[PDB]
Amino acid sequence: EKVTLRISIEGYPPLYEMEAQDNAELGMIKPDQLASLNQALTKGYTYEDILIVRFRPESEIYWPISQDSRNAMIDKLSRNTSVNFEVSLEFKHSKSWLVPISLDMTIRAKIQSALRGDPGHPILIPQSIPAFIQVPNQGELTLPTSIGNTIIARAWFDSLTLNLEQGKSQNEKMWIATSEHPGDQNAKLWIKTANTTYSGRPYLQVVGFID
Ligand SMILES: [Pt+2]
Ligand SMILES: [Pt+2]
Ligand SMILES: [Pt+2]
Ligand SMILES: [Pt+2]
Ligand SMILES: [Pt+2]
């Protein structure tokens, strides 16, 4: 089984790439976690069907973008119409979501500054990654619309926040990615996410339902 996540400004080398290969234990999911999830909704899938995928939030390779391509990317924001991009791949089955970057200039200026690497400038990509995804035998991944419609790109999606590592050499550019839920981040519906042993940061998490 294999999962990759990629987060980028469309057209350009990803800010963030991560590979999952859960990780990593024999069981797909904690067996209280489906009883606490199933109860929180108040679908017929069993523990062997539910995968908890966890992405290390630091990109797995340094950002390899050329300065010129990076400059071009920033300039594109100076005028109009660009979209955030991200993709999930198992393992054959993929989905990519496009999230429009607001034409609001005070925030386009915030992205631009973040892309330049200024301290104190995250890149908010709101409602951009699903906490839950469904992977089928044929075709691209799908959303569990049932789960979505209960919660309140799509409205129930998690939001992303991306930061460039500060103080590193020009050939060592890391984006770090953080996630959070819309509304109550503490809701029981959310399978709680783990942190990493090596860095102490939260995993990027998606719960997959397998067919
Ligand atoms: Pt197994
Ligand atoms: Pt198992
Ligand atoms: Pt600023
Ligand atoms: Pt780093
Ligand atoms: Pt940090």
Side-chain angles (χ1 to χ4, degrees), residues 1-44 46-167 169-211:
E1 294 290 350
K2 182 186 187 45
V3 200
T4 65
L5 164 69
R6 298 163 66 85
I7 303 175
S8 61
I9 308 273
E10 171 178 55
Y12 307 91
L15 319 181
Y16 167 99
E17 294 177 30
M18 177 49 57
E19 197 185 75
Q21 212 138 258
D22 289 345
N23 0 263
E25 60 321 326
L26 51 64
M28 325 317 132
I29 183 172
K30 179 175 317 160
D32 205 356
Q33 278 174 348
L34 180 59
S36 178
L37 161 67
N38 166 272
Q39 193 235 354
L41 293 61
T42 307
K43 183 170 280 289
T46 44
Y47 305 129
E48 48 182 345
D49 304 312
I50 302 178
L51 267 192
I52 307 188
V53 183
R54 272 154 181 176
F55 294 101
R56 302 188 313 272
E58 311 87 2
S59 187
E60 71 194 6
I61 48 119
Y62 289 117
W63 197 25
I65 197 170
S66 52
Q67 188 52 255
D68 281 9
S69 271
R70 164 179 205 207
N71 277 349
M73 193 171 47
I74 300 173
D75 160 83
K76 188 141 219 168
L77 275 171
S78 254
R79 42 182 183 278
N80 303 92
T81 318
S82 62
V83 274
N84 272 305
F85 197 174
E86 71 219 61
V87 182
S88 311
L89 191 86
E90 293 91 349
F91 56 82
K92 284 176 161 175
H93 302 106
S94 70
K95 189 48 180 65
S96 305
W97 285 279
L98 291 21
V99 179
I101 287 159
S102 175
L103 282 51
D104 181 343
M105 82 177 74
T106 187
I107 76 95
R108 259 173 193 236
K110 287 304 192 164
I111 310 184
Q112 284 188 332
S113 176
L115 292 182
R116 292 246 166 228
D118 297 333
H121 291 71
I123 286 181
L124 195 136
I125 310 167
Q127 304 160 334
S128 40
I129 185 163
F132 301 95
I133 192 77
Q134 177 200 2
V135 2
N137 283 335
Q138 304 156 44
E140 32 162 57
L141 318 157
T142 188
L143 318 175
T145 305
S146 57
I147 296 171
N149 282 336
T150 58
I151 288 167
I152 189 49
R154 269 321 290 129
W156 58 278
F157 278 21
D158 280 354
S159 280
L160 283 173
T161 296
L162 264 91
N163 289 291
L164 257 168
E165 229 176 74
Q166 298 295 324
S169 86
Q170 272 312 279
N171 54 293
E172 257 147 54
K173 315 203 264 277
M174 292 177 72
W175 286 87
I176 302 181
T178 166
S179 201
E180 56 195 32
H181 304 309
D184 186 345
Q185 171 90 358
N186 286 304
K188 298 191 277 230
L189 177 125
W190 305 123
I191 292 213
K192 308 291 202 163
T193 213
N195 300 270
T196 75
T197 68
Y198 71 95
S199 64
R201 292 197 188 82
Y203 279 105
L204 276 187
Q205 204 167 259
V206 51
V207 173
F209 300 113
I210 307 294
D211 299 323

